[PDB]
Symmetry: C3
Subunit: 187 residues, 3 copies
């Protein structure tokens, strides 16, 4: 009733590819194939998140509650100061919706048409709540995507995007870069 996080002790026992310092992971999150999951320093991952398969997170990042990172074999990577708000999904693989293929994990590979590609969230990216990020996209440096937004293509740096599928609505301010430097100085 205070917090649900693993102790540093139990964290070491999960078997992550790598795990940094001050990492707070919820016991109510699911972690599958931790040997291909790498986490930097100062990371928080909240209840009912799912990390599955190849996932790489840097430093100063919050993965809020209910968020699913399906990294598959090609991987999802987040850079430093990226953050994901609650209930987001990031897929590195998805089934073909068109009608040209059978679908999903109960069906063999030879009948499906899985679309796959590494997803990267560059530095300072923020993903708004209830959003969905499709495979093989780079979310540009300093990009913000609004709540309930859907991204199927890579996003140009330093813009704010909204909607389903997203469209660009205004520049993201770049004062956070100064703040990053100021913050890192003080440390």
């Amino acid at each position: 009733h205070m917090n649900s996080f693993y102790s540093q002790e139990e964290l070491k026992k999960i078997g992550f590819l790598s795990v940094g310092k001050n990492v707070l992971i919820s016991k109510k999150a699911s972690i599958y194939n931790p040997g291909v999951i790498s986490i930097g320093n100062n990371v928080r991952i909240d209840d009912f998140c799912i990390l599955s398969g190849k996932v790489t997170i840097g430093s100063y990042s919050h993965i809020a509650a209910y968020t699913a990172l399906y990294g598959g074999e090609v991987g999802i990577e987040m850079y430093d100061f990226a953050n994901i708000t609650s209930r987001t999904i990031v897929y590195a693989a998805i089934d073909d919706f068109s009608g040209n293929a059978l679908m999903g994990p109960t069906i063999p590979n030879q009948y499906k048409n899985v679309k796959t590609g590494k997803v990267i969230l560059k530095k300072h990216v923020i993903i708004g709540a209830h959003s969905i990020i499709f495979p093989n996209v780079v979310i540009g440096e300093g990009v913000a995507v609004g709540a309930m937004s859907m991204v199927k293509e890579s996003l140009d740096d330093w813009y704010i995007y909204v909607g389903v599928p997203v469209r660009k609505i205004k520049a993201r301010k770049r004062k956070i870069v100064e703040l990053e430097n100021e913050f890192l100085k003080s440390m």
Copy 2:
């Protein structure tokens, strides 16, 4: 170590499945221990089914065979029921309701209020063969989703949908026909068993 630490998968053993009390459960059935199943005596499931973490199945729910019910998905079947036919699949974080309250302001609402004061709209939800429901979608009561229909991510379905079309939006609109190459694939895949 990994398997027993809970970091390979979360599914019940087949021994455990039997102890849950499903009306009917098939072979090769993988259900997360982190899903919630309420009133398993009215729930039945065919063969080759996977139901992921944090799903909820409550009340009358019938799933056939070769179906994935992805993580966070809730199926509230109540007394009227939700049925999915074979090769139907539902992506993450979908909700299907066989009953909802009246939003108009003409009735009181939800499970803390007695029924005489409510005006619950109920009706069976059927997803026919090869239906795919994209992530973060909502299906409302008394809806038939026709054979081969695809609903896009973040879509809301309040009416029955025509077979073999793709629909998107809130509420959904028809955008293009679904291809039917899958009808061949099904035949070819079953023909090698």
Copy 3:
């Protein structure tokens, strides 16, 4: 059958206050119950998160997956308010503009958190998969539809839909007549 805590388990949780016929999932998360007040006849379902200052009245259903982050300012729901599944209510959020660093991994002085009490008045219903931002008063009798986003207070007795929401029709007031009927039948 059901996942609710017993009366005995509820009292071990430590709520600032908790009423009778309160049905709370064991698979929900409650953080800082010390600042959480709940009235009578309340149901909170699987995979809910209530964290920080949250006050709920009576005759309210918080459906599954719903997160209420009250932080320090608080979230408050008045009687007969209800929240359908997978809603988020935030009493604080980060500045998205690019003028401020973001989130719990960063000290306050580099961030620009907007904070303010969120209030849902009597007979409010929030449709599934919706988001309510800080410092919003949802007026008495408001319905917001599924997949709504609400960034600003909403006028009483209207139905709103969309992202961000727009007012589409009046909500009917018969529900107040039913409220008084129901309450009357329960006192005599």
